[PDB]
From Swiss-Prot, chain A:
SUBUNIT field: Component of the U4/U6-U5 tri-snRNP complex composed of the U4, U6 and U5 snRNAs and at least PRP3, PRP4, PRP6, PRP8, PRP18, PRP31, PRP38, SNU13, SNU23, SNU66, SNU114, SPP381, SMB1, SMD1, SMD2, SMD3, SMX2, SMX3, LSM2, LSM3, LSM4, LSM5, LSM6, LSM7, LSM8, BRR2 and DIB1.
Job of this protein: Functions as a scaffold that mediates the ordered assembly of spliceosomal proteins and snRNAs. Required for association of BRR2 with the spliceosomal U5 snRNP, and the subsequent assembly of the U4/U6-U5 tri-snRNP complex. Functions as a scaffold that positions spliceosomal U2, U5 and U6 snRNAs at splice sites on pre-mRNA substrates, so that splicing can occur. Interacts with both the 5' and the 3' splice site, as well as the branch region. Has a role in branch site-3' splice site selection. Associates with the branch site-3' splice 3'-exon region. Also has a role in cell cycle.
Entire protein: shown range: 1836 to 2069 of 2413
Record note on what altering residue 21 to N does: Reduced growth at 30 degrees Celsius. Strongly reduced growth at 16 degrees Celsius
UniProt effect for mutating residue 21 to A: Alters protein folding. Severely impaired growth. Strongly reduced growth at 35 degrees Celsius
Name of the molecule in the record: Pre-mRNA-splicing factor 8
Other remarks on this protein: Present with 468 molecules/cell in log phase SD medium.
Gene that encodes the chain: PRP8
Source organism of the structure: Saccharomyces cerevisiae (strain ATCC 204508 / S288c) (Baker's yeast)
Curated annotation (Swiss-Prot), chain B:
Gene3D superfamilies per record: 2.60.34.20, Aar2, C-terminal domain-like
Protein name (record): A1 cistron-splicing factor AAR2
Oligomeric form and interacting partners: Heterodimer. Interacts with PRP8 (via RNase H homology domain and MPN domain), competing with BRR2 for the same binding site. Component of a U5 snRNP complex that contains at least the U5 snRNA, PRP8, SNU114, AAR2, SMB1, SMD1, SMD2, SMD3, SME1, SMX2 and SMX3, but is not a component of the U4/U6-U5 tri-snRNP complex.
Modified residues (Phosphothreonine): 257
Source organism: Saccharomyces cerevisiae (strain ATCC 204508 / S288c) (Baker's yeast)
Length: 237, 300
């Protein structure tokens, strides 16, 4: 059924699964019109579809043209997400298709269930975890490819870089969620922490630097401090 | 006017005939119900005094044969039987009427309630939902499960209602997923009406039969069927005007007849609030919405 803290380790077993986050599919800026009314302008978005065991991020870029002439866009966005995830599953060989898809928001259950009726053996699951995947657009290279897109496009990045050569997928997911939680709570500071040392380069093909094991410990501690810091600033603690 | 004689009443039982219920005491000189209106299906149903478990009963149409009730002390229930000897039957009834051993179907003349509850219900369609082809009447009890319930266990004893599943490949056209899920008109009009039921009368007949089974037997599966068939119409943006007007009348009389004190065991809060207040047809069921709001405003 639902994915929570009791069954957290199931994410890293050998049954293929994907997380789907739709919080950046339909993105707008709100502005005033010449007549003093309010209007929205859509900007490019993305579906965040992640294998938490391997780090494979299948980033489907949602170009603003898909909204043209459509109504009820927040509702359409959930069905467009489900359509694209179903299309991705069908494109994958049978032995690569997921056994479970975990949606980060419960409003995705029915749209994805309906689009996946042809796959009765794939379980569609919600989660009780509050995952910080909305902050994926705070990863500079991901935000860049989304904003530059002139047409629908799928892009592939490993969201763990080469970490799995040295750590397990449990630890890698934990690092990722800590980095994203920090970028979500204070993006400026988080980015300051990550690139304050010009000798650790963010490598061309990597989202975060080439930190050594010891440097990741320092980074991870600085990120917890930031999260705790912001928690205190927020709540006056 | 037709008659269903009883051989005897050896165990204390509440007997119902359509919307009327009455008590028969153990070994009371009861020998049936006379003056049953011709032209309608009817249901004669039972709840034993010593075990209110298993309400059960029989759907029948006196035009299709001569039927009587006889208690079976081995299987412990009142059974419907057909008498093939016409002159034997007429002679039996006449003696029981002369001795005034039969209660009278008490049809008030102003009253169209039973017609309005069974307008589209036909014996031939009942007998396809309830499969026991050697009899002209159909047995139903509270515990019988529907074909759907058994997909999700004895098939000879099932209620074969038409399966209605909103998240099913039958309900959803490849490539129209959002369209078909949010507006169920394709499923209602093409799959169900044109395809399975053939016409709205047959659809309403199954809807009305499901309600009556749910209310008279407290059959949970029947209740699920009734609400599913309501929701399918209310959740369709394109419904013929005559179907909406007839549905409003059908539901009005069903809600009017429901025992006030069973509205917790026969009415689904989600379906009714959705149907009356959120659905495409939220404004098309004026009679049903008014009686619901005045009779069961808690549920809403
Ligand atoms: C970053 S996506 C990725 N990464 C490394 C190797 C393959 C893929 C990929 O597109 N995949 C499609 C199904 C199997 C994996
Ligand atoms: C067959 S109706 C019947 N039978 C036996 C005793 C009374 C009635 C009767 O007039 N009824 C009207 C209200 C409920 C029952
Ligand atoms: C009309 S459904 C009904 N009627 C009378 C007694 C019980 C029920 C009921 O809610 N049920 C739910 C589980 C099976 C039975
Ligand atoms: C006719 S509705 C029905 N019938 C029998 C068993 C379950 C249901 C039911 O409520 N369902 C909800 C989703 C699909 C099944």
């Amino acid at each position: 059924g639902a994915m929570n803290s009791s069954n957290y380790a199931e994410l890293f077993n050998n049954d293929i699964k994907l997380f789907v986050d739709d919080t950046n599919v339909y993105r707008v800026t709100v502005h005033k019109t010449f007549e003093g009314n309010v209007a929205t302008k859509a900007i490019n978005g993305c579906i965040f579809t992640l294998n938490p065991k391997t780090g494979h991020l299948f980033l489907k870029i949602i170009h603003t043209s898909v909204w043209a002439g459509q109504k009820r866009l927040s509702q359409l966005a959930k069905w467009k997400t489900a359509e694209e995830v179903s299309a991705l599953v069908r494109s994958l060989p049978k032995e690569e298709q997921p056994k479970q898809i975990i949606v980060t928001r419960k409003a995705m259950l029915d749209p994805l269930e309906v689009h996946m009726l042809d796959f009765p053996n794939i379980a569609i699951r919600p989660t009780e975890l509050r995952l910080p995947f909305s902050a994926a657009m705070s990863i500079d290279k991901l935000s860049d490819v989304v904003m530059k897109a002139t047409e629908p496009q799928m892009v592939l990045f490993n969201i763990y870089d080469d970490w799995l050569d040295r750590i397990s997928s449990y630890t890698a997911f934990s690092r990722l969620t800590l980095l994203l939680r920090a970028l979500k709570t204070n993006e400026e500071s988080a980015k300051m922490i990550l690139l304050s040392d010009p000798t650790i380069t963010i490598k061309s093909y990597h989202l975060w630097p080439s930190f050594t094991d010891e440097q990741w410990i320092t980074i991870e501690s600085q990120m917890r401090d930031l999260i705790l810091t912001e928690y205190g600033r927020k709540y006056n603690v | 006017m037709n008659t269903v004689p009883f051989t005897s009443a050896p165990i204390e039982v509440t007997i119902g005939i359509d919307q009327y219920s009455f008590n028969v005491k153990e070994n009371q000189p009861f020998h049936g119900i006379k003056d049953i209106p011709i032209g309608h299906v009817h249901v004669i149903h039972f709840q034993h005094a010593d075990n209110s478990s298993m309400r059960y009963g029989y759907w029948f149409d006196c035009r299709m044969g001569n039927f009587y009730i006889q208690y079976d002390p081995k299987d412990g229930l009142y059974k419907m039987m057909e008498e093939r000897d016409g002159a034997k039957f007429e002679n039996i009834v006449h003696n029981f009427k002369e001795r005034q051993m039969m209660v009278s179907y008490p049809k008030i003349d102003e009253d169209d309630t039973w017609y309005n509850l069974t307008e589209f219900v036909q014996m031939d369609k009942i007998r396809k939902i309830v499969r026991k082809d050697e009899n002209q009447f159909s047995y139903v009890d509270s515990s019988m499960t529907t074909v759907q319930e058994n997909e999700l266990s004895d098939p000879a004893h099932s209620l074969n209602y038409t399966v209605i599943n909103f998240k099913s490949r039958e309900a959803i056209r490849p490539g129209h997923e959002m369209e078909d899920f949010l507006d169920k008109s394709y499923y209602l009009n093409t799959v169900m009406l044109q395809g399975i039921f053939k016409n709205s009368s047959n659809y309403f007949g199954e809807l009305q039969f499901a309600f009556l089974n749910a209310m008279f037997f407290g059959n949970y599966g029947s209740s699920l069927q009734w609400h599913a068939m309501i929701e399918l119409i209310c959740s369709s943006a394109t419904v013929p005007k005559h179907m909406l007007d007839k549905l409003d009348e059908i539901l009005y009389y069903q809600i009017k007849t429901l025992p006030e004190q069973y509205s917790d065991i026969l009415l689904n809060e989600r379906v009714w609030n959705i149907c009356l207040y959120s659905s495409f047809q939220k404004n098309s069921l004026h009679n049903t919405e008014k009686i619901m709001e005045n009779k069961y405003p808690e549920l809403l």
